[PDB]
């Protein structure tokens, strides 16, 4: 699998007349997230980052005909692109557990999944034996939230006067109910003034400076372990 793959044990709901009336599935999603604290059974994911070298692939249908004993590629073509296979993933909605309360979550969009059948061992070079950890109770920094009023679609406009986070369809409705509220200045969501953030290698106090050799934020206690401390 080259691309976006799904991992079991993750909050992963659905993106998005007589089909939209089942919108209550998102309301039940947020009901279940608040009803149960989710350790989510964090796991022992042991993966092999294989540098799979595919090349000059022939387009092939699902896996049952790309099985080695029934296709028999030439020496030019070297892999088989499974066109109508894999899953081709989806999805925005995902709970976050921001600080001490629940939210949502609009994950990164524009996904794919392209699967290639490789038939000889020298096209696969294992590189790293990655042991990694997936826990839903940690922070999810890809954290586009929804409209406060409409509680629905992903917000992309922040009115600093209104102190509310809004998507386009609700944001028009915020400013038309009165003549007075039409003239609120409307900055997009972008990078609203929120904070600068406390340090991660030790909590409590916020970042103050910048490093510029290894590009990372520097706090007041951080320059001592910085070897170049000036830049």
């Amino acid at each position: 699998a080259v691309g976006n793959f799904s991992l079991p044990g993750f909050p992963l709901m659905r993106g998005g007349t007589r089909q939209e009336e089942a919108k209550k599935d998102r309301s039940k999603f947020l009901d279940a997230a608040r009803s149960q604290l989710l350790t989510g059974e964090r796991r022992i994911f042991e993966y092999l980052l294989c540098q799979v070298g595919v090349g000059r692939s022939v387009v092939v249908e699902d896996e049952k005909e790309a099985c080695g004993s029934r296709f028999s590629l030439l020496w030019e073509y070297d892999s088989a692109y499974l066109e109508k296979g894999a899953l081709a993933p989806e999805e925005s909605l995902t709970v976050h557990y921001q600080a001490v309360d629940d939210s949502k979550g609009v994950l990164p969009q524009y996904t794919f999944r392209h699967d290639y059948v490789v038939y000889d061992s020298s096209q696969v070079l294992p590189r790293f034996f990655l042991l990694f950890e997936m826990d839903p109770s940690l922070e999810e920094l890809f954290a586009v939230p929804l409209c406060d009023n409409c509680q629905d679609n992903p917000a992309c406009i922040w009115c600093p006067a209104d102190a509310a986070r809004l998507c386009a369809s609700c944001d028009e409705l915020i400013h038309q109910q009165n003549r007075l509220v039409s003239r609120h200045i409307r900055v997009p969501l972008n990078e609203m003034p929120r904070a600068f953030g406390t340090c991660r290698r030790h909590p409590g106090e916020v970042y103050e400076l910048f490093c510029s050799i290894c590009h990372v934020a520097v706090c007041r206690l951080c320059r001592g372990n910085h070897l170049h401390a000036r830049s």
Partner: peptide
């Protein structure tokens, strides 16, 4: 959104049966 978009979804289907 933010460039990309219309060129991403057109070459997502790399099987050139056109």
């Amino acid at each position: 959104t933010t460039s990309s978009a219309d060129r991403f979804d057109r070459l997502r289907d790399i099987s050139l049966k056109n």
